[PDB]
Design a protein around this ligand. Structure first.
Ligand SMILES: O=c1ccn([C@@H]2O[C@H](COP(=O)(O)OP(=O)(O)O)[C@@H](O)[C@H]2O)c(=O)[nH]1
Lengths: 505, 504, 505, 505
């Protein structure tokens, strides 16, 4: 007999695991428990803070929900109006020393004239071939050339996507992008070139809210707080070291054993294979691909420069900086960095030289969060990446050479993005059903490895829907039909369902 | 305060209502109750019998299940292997003196060559056009011609569908057919023509099962029997006459009042609006279109003729018979008609003449079930339709003039098919949201009026999913996404889910 | 027996007849003569002069030669370099207050933006449609729309062509336009729009030459002059009144009769039929359609205005003027109008008002030549047309209200354009063979009624080739295969052929 | 100064040279003469006879004319009705034991059902792709696949064409085939498949005439006979050995020199380059490609067998025989082989065995003429080719093993077909104009190397038109525009033109 027995054990307390927990807690039927090796829940949706008081999320995190259930839980956890800030998405792409509104492909109008001709010519060729196309594109690259043409492909899509995905567009599938990659309309785009008009509204994150305190991690801390504490085990005491799939037993680092009837595993599935000592699973998970994410944080002295303004996040396709994206993190909340009266010495100027004075001085302060991808196809020198990011901020004119840096942050996240490679699905349809036969629901950004349903809401609902399948025979819609859930408002499932209304009387 | 109060009230005990009831019974949470004006549950999935002992379903009823949950409930209701008979899905199209295997286009080698030429030319035109198509068809008619070409459309799908729907194909939408591209398989069709080959779309793995006893209606009696009797109210005592949606009160014919928190209504939505005395909904539901169904049954003396053979159901595009479909119902179960030793007098011969003798003779017997549609655009003379069907049987060479008819059956079903008109969705998306705002789940063949999710399995699951929506916040997939549920096997939901395992 | 007998009789001494005569003269085999009712050769390629000394051709006459033989004859006729002036082929379209360089579509950058948008959108439709087109257009109108799209077609080619042909574009065939595919050059059009530029289809290479003296008519006087005078009969003495086909006899005004073995007739075929008293051919030729041409000339005082500049001919699609084309005729040669020292009084101001003085003043002078079409489908008030044209010049900003007009000219030419109606070929394939069965070669702008080979060079060569068919069995390429002769370098036939080189030895 | 001096020298007296000569003789202006290294004119349109009395043309030669001028000359040369026989083309393709009516691709209906499926499927794929194609095929092979599909390509077009052309279809251009390779109509072909109908009327030689005596060579002997003998020089005395383009002098084998002003050369252009001692031209002509033709003749004892019947010529794509074509030469004229009363011993049986006796027996007789191609890509064993042909006749059931052969013929013609390679036009555009600038008209099947205009009537007219260009400035239409001359009735040029009629008066 194990030290503990539950009907449903949940491994991991990032958004996916917390979703499972919240639904299990709502249903209030089967016995359950949730573990995490980190004292603080949140996973990749956590927030660090530097010794100088600058917060950094794990790169640009912005909340946009496809589901009422997710909204209910966020609202329950942070109920007050002042718990949140609402923002309009101000996003641009850096091209030829100018800012082009996102998305690039919908704003050819803001490019130099020569590039406009190249881009429109390409789009015209794409339009004409699309008129007689009877096959579907097989790769990301093919999709790009078919929907946008060579000009936009060469000028932006190919270099940008390598820079973020850390693999070439030719290596990726194209079934994942319905809600990620705007397909430009030939008429609309040439119309906007003629009129000198912009088109900045595409996509589900054109408007967003952000938590007032604690960064994104504050959401997940607060959501986890609504759970019955005795059913949680966060910390070294919650680290899973072994999974015995055959005896339905999990063993924690400190030796505690947990018996389960059903397992919801949200750890990276490659890690799960290893913990299962299941060599067949290990070899299959090794066929999957992922990129690592470097997050670099820079804290800067001074009121917000006019050149920065209300910008939220910014894309960098070009080669004068190593990061693919920058977020003006100080625009998301005034509590993402120190108050103006906080005294901090300058650590260095942006040009890398030492400050004239070592004296602690006041603010105000603003804050830039940078992301740099890494993979076996795109190596990164970890020792120079911080300095390279800062010089890149100078190169791109985000920072003046004389700007004063009062805080820095660098952290590498090994599992950053699950790459939509050509091989992904062939591999997953071997992995998942083999786990499913053992009553293991492997779910989440790396639990199920599907980026198109890899945001916080998707993740949370992967957890919720796993529970709903386990208990109520629900369809795992988010897991198996990304375009379906992303294309509709999912209003049916609520934090209070009829089951609870009826049972209360 | 009403005589009875329940959390969820279910109106109607056809497949849809029985689905709601089965799921509620499984969940064993909220209180509930199911009513029907008929003593026998089953609705349009019920079965009649003539005084001569010949059963007739409400027209051809062949089960193809898209759902494990539905299978679970059928298996539970009729668990024994000898409760069912299995058959291949054998069907033909009657055309120009031939039984052409379905699908029609793969079998046109049976037609005269000159006709084959016109068919192939038309399908070539359609394939060339499909190659450069950049719009979807807007009408059923457009969809038909783009798939088949002119000549083939004119021979089968066009005239057949008018005889079925009782409205022209030019007046119907085509989204209900699903997302498949409307385009010919030119090579498959031309290949069979070149080879002089025929081929039906059936075989050892393309089968259906039919209940051994009581016809299709036997399934629903069995399913209903698994319910707690006290939570059902079937018959005159269960007829709903008034629905006060603001009080959430329903009034029965005998005067009994039922209070509910949520209503699952499976009656025809047009009757619901009348029962609600809601003038806006009456006006809206009166904008929907439907056809009535005449079911004609003919019992015949003799062993099964070779010309009939293993045929299951048959299509009639031509105008030498009024029915659009015939079913050799005697092929579905031996118990659909009397045993061979049963003695019955001949009522008439197939050509209408009187029999030589009035004496009762033995069988064996076989049985034909016919369907004729009726709408404002296609009237039916109820006084001659039986005789006209029987003449139709002679014209189509199903019966010889000498065949001895020993039983006849005719019944008209007012609400038979809900029509996928071009206007349907424009109307439904005003009716359904309004009923939803009043906590009324109107669901079913005429509850929600969507033919593409209008079979027994869809109907059942419409009731199941409505309850799952009410209780567990489930998505109503069958209701809103027919292509979704029809394109996959729905395995997740079971008669025994985790929740019931953990509870015990 | 007739008064005169020849092998080959040529009726008409316009370019077609002169071509026939030049080839007969070169061949110097069969006997021949050429007659004309006019003492001056040239036909519709003649030139008038006003009492004030302003020359006017019969509307804008610009030579583009497809044939070496035609070049040879023009050179022989006017051999000196100073017999010609050379000009670039400079033309514009008057549209919405702008002079848009030709071709119209490559220059829509001059139009307002919202209109550019509508033009480009329509041309995009046209390009997409052209990509899947498997049929040839059947009318002029369909051809226009397929080449240009709706918006651009509505701005220029549609209203302009109605004003030219005096019949709707929907009533004309399109084979006469050549074999080129009716499809947009979308990239060239959007590229000039994107670059905001203009560009006409002329330059140092795209030029025409124009006779230094006597207008276009000086060419044909000089060509005719190389003929043996005794073989010509020009004037009232040369007017044909009767053609007896069955007897092969022609009768002139003064009662003179000419017998022939072969007849080359260049008179309007409908007139030929009348002259033949052939009721059947009369009935057929009346089924042909033609427009009449009003030529209006305006002589103006002043040096050439800057706004006019080097413009040569100009197109007018809009209805603020009755003319479809204007020519800056004073730009073709300084001898098309009086020298600056010549003195003329002002007849009226461009706004119609009387001049302040009636005194004769000096120049310099410039000159405008306008064309107005007329047909049953489009009447012309011959009494107001001059004044309407002059108002048109003001409306189109060609003339200021103050401009001083010193000379006016108006002449109506009954057979002006042979119309390429949908019916034209069905009628001509009945007419020409019947004439051919009688050894009658009916050829020329109205001799054979085919606009696409209705220019000076085509006409001249129609006569040349008819003679060559008569004598040497040559194929009549120009007559029967317009696309062939217009698409190739016609260098084989020369004014001096082997036959003449060999004979003189 | 040279021994002889003429305005126009014609080298070669095959159809092309005789065409030149006939026209120079009709014009009767410039002096001229014609020379040939052979005493009997006719070139590749000549006829041999075996010692046993069996005639053989140089492979299947059948007369079909696009030109009245050609007709006039044949009719003048052989004016009597009994000089000619008229025949319906009866032509088949040997495929899988069956005779498939010509053209193969229009008679899929005669193939076995399984092959019908493969062929139609292929034609369906081709039709669908052709619906959206916007590029011309570049190679013969591409054209084949595009117009007929892969089933017919593999079954018939690819093996058959290598077998005639002696190069693979991938090496040839496709601009030459308008009148040679039928493009099948999907509806028509599948309709005949369904109805079991044949379609055997395609093409310009569906009906033909053949001279009653002397074989094809009889025509050119008779045509040459109409020329002034003193202007001809045929035999060793007329063999050109040297051409000096700069001096415009030709040297014959016997040392005779001839000065010309204009040269019409009809010898193979590669021979001309060598004779010119012009290394640059030799180098260019070596870039052309040609196949050699082996003609094999077999005379057979017996009345015409029923399996042969009225067959004219037959095609053999299969590798069970070396010949690409067989002609039933005895069907063309009763005078192509001996009378029935002639006694001839049996030389061999068709199975290869010697016959019993040397007894000379009577006929009647019939005759098969076979063609085998050869090139550097397709060697032929000359020592066995006769026996291989005869065994081929047995494999294809044309001859029974016991058939008695009474005469055999074999001759190799070095230049047989000028191959339409991809490179041909590029090379000819460097060759022909260079010769033209030296007053050399190189014309004919190997004079100008263009197969699409390589028939007897084409060749003749290339000579006629060259003279017409030289004397009268005519366009050389056949040479430069094969589809033009092949698609029209060429009726204008006659043996008696207006010129001769007028001068005779
Ligand atoms: O059934 C047939 C027979 C021949 N050809 C083609 O026709 C061409 C010309 O052959 P033809 O015998 O008419 O001319 P010849 O070889 O005598 O020059 C060949 O190269 C073949 O490719 C064809 O398309 N279908």
């Amino acid at each position: 007999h194990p030290d503990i027995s539950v009907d449903v054990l949940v491994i991991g307390a990032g958004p996916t695991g917390l979703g499972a927990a919240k639904r299990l807690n709502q249903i209030d039927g089967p016995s359950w428990m949730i573990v995490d090796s980190n004292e603080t829940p949140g996973g990749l949706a956590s927030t660090d803070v530097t010794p100088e008081g600058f917060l950094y999320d794990v790169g640009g995190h912005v909340i946009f929900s496809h589901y009422k259930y997710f909204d209910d839980c966020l609202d329950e956890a942070l109920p007050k109006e002042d718990d949140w800030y609402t923002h309009q998405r101000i996003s641009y792409v850096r091209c030829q020393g100018q800012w082009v509104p996102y998305p690039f492909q919908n704003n050819i109008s803001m490019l130099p004239k020569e590039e406009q001709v190249k881009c429109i010519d390409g789009m015209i060729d794409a339009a004409l071939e699309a008129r007689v196309a009877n096959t579907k594109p097989k790769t990301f690259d093919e999709w790009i050339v078919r929907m946008m043409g060579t000009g936009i492909a060469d000028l932006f899509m190919r270099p940008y996507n390598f820079k973020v995905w850390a693999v070439p567009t030719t290596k990726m599938q194209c079934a994942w992008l319905g809600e990620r990659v705007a397909a430009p309309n030939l008429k609309a785009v040439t119309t906007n070139v003629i009129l000198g008009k912009t088109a900045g509204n595409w996509g589900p994150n054109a408007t967003f809210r952000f938590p007032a305190r604690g960064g994104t991690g504050g959401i997940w801390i607060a959501v986890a707080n609504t759970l019955p504490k005795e059913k949680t085990r966060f910390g070294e005491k919650g680290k899973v070291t072994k999974v015995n799939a055959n005896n339905k037993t999990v063993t924690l680092q400190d030796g505690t054993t947990i018996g389960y009837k059903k397992l919801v595993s949200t750890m990276a599935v490659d890690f799960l294979a290893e913990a299962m000592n299941d060599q067949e699973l290990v070899g299959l998970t090794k066929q999957l691909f992922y990129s690592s994410t470097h997050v670099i944080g820079v804290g800067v002295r001074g009121s917000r420069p006019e050149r920065i303004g209300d910008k939220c996040w910014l894309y960098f396709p070009e080669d004068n900086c190593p990061f693919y994206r920058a977020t003006i993190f100080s625009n998301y909340s005034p509590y993402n960095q120190p108050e103006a009266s906080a005294a901090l010495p300058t650590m260095q100027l942006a040009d890398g030289s030492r400050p004239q004075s070592t004296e602690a001085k006041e603010g105000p302060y603003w804050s830039i969060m940078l992301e740099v991808s890494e993979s076996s196809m795109k190596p990164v020198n970890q020792e120079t990446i911080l300095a390279d990011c800062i010089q890149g901020l100078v190169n791109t004119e985000m920072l003046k050479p004389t700007d004063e840096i009062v805080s820095t942050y660098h952290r590498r996240f090994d599992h950053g993005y699950p790459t939509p490679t050509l091989e992904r699905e062939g591999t997953l349809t071997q992995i998942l059903p083999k786990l499913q036969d053992k009553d293991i629901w492997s779910r989440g950004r790396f639990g199920s490895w599907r980026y198109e349903v890899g945001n916080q809401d998707h993740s949370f609902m992967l957890g919720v829907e796993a529970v709903d399948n386990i208990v109520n025979g629900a369809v795992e819609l988010t897991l198996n039909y990304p375009d379906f859930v992303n294309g509709r408002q999912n209003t049916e499932r609520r934090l209070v369902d009829g089951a609870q209304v009826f049972a209360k009387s």
